[PDB]
């Protein structure tokens, strides 16, 4: 199973959402600013996308 998308770093949040939903159509996608703190529960259905101030991906997206 594809569970990380390092090729998406530096792409637009729009392209990242599209690509992740092709690989994982039931994904629950959550967009958050890079450099924030988040809770440490592990959810197989979730993919957080951390964006910079330009709305580009700033951290490797992964399931969790």
């Amino acid at each position: 199973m594809k569970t990380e998308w390092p090729e998406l770093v530096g792409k637009s949040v729009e392209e990242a959402k599209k690509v992740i939903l092709q690989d994982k159509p039931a994904a629950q996608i959550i967009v958050l600013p890079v450099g924030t703190i988040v809770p440490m529960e592990y959810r197989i259905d979730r993919v957080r996308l951390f964006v910079d101030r330009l709305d580009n991906i700033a951290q490797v997206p992964r399931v969790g």
């Binding site: 924030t36 703190i37 529960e41």
Partner: protein, 281 residues
């Protein structure tokens, strides 16, 4: 009837309960998304919100802080689950918005509130991949002030020989906690590295959820409060022990598992921790 989740038994909390110790008079700050104070299996003693637009710390619109708090301190009664330290004084320090993110300044302000309000233990089931000097200073100050500070190691799994422990767990002054399952196997998501300190149950952990519910979650989020609750049990049996002593007692009495890069010192054992003489089992 009440149920005792497997993880509370696995860390040997029932041995302290049978000795008569349940975290009474110990003040534990759950620095998190709030705690639902209306839940009948929780008693929340106080708290504060550091989230500018979400000023009620007793409303948990995320669900995460409520689950974490139940592992620390769900009440001993005839309902729901039983917490590790069911008599602890539980404080909701809300630093995450409903959306499940917080600014570094909000977490820092929550740590400062805990120090100013004489919390004995801080649990942070939270993290980020970068540090800041201000964040390190806040956790260092709490520990200098006598607080036991416990955090989730992170859910980054492995990355070759690199450490994947996030902050604030990665700071030396904070006890970073990874996750095992009921067979003591490291969970695949659990962060690794020389900063990993001890392990606790973090797979399929039943606890309290908002609106009088219960449910099983996974994460180093779930592992951290077993250790914060164990620190409260130890302090209720030894109210003069310093945070230094509470930390050593947990580290020095784990059940060793595998290599320390993946398992740190192994699984906590609060029964052994709370004796005067410490060794590993």
């Amino acid at each position: 009837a009440q149920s005792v989740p497997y993880g509370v038994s696995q860390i040997k909390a029932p041995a302290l309960h049978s000795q008569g110790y349940t975290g009474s008079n110990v003040k534990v700050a759950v620095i998190d998304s709030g705690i639902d104070s209306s839940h009948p299996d929780l008693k929340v003693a106080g708290g504060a919100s550091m989230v500018p637009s979400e000023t009620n710390p007793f409303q948990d619109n995320n669900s995460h802080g409520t689950h974490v708090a139940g592992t620390v301190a769900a009440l001993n009664n005839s309902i729901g689950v039983l917490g590790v330290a069911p008599s602890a004084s539980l404080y909701a320090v809300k630093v995450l918005g409903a959306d499940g993110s917080g600014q570094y300044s909000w977490i820092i302000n929550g740590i400062e509130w805990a120090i100013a309000n004489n919390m004995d233990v801080i649990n942070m089931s939270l993290g980020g991949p970068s540090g800041s000097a201000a964040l390190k200073a806040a956790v260092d100050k709490a520990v200098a002030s006598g607080v036991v500070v416990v955090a989730a190691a992170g859910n980054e799994g492995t990355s070759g020989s690199s450490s994947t422990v996030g902050y604030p767990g990665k700071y030396p002054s904070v006890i970073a906690v990874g996750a095992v399952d009921s067979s003591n196997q490291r969970a695949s998501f659990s962060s690794v590295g020389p900063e990993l300190d001890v392990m606790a149950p973090g797979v399929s952990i039943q606890s309290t959820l908002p609106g009088n519910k219960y449910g099983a979650y996974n994460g180093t989020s779930m592992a951290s409060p077993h250790v914060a609750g164990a620190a409260a049990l130890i302090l209720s049996k030894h109210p003069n022990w310093t945070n230094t002593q509470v930390r050593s007692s947990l580290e020095n009495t784990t059940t060793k598992l595998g290599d320390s890069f993946y398992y740190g010192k192994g699984l906590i054992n609060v029964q052994a921790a709370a004796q005067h003489h410490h060794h590993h089992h």
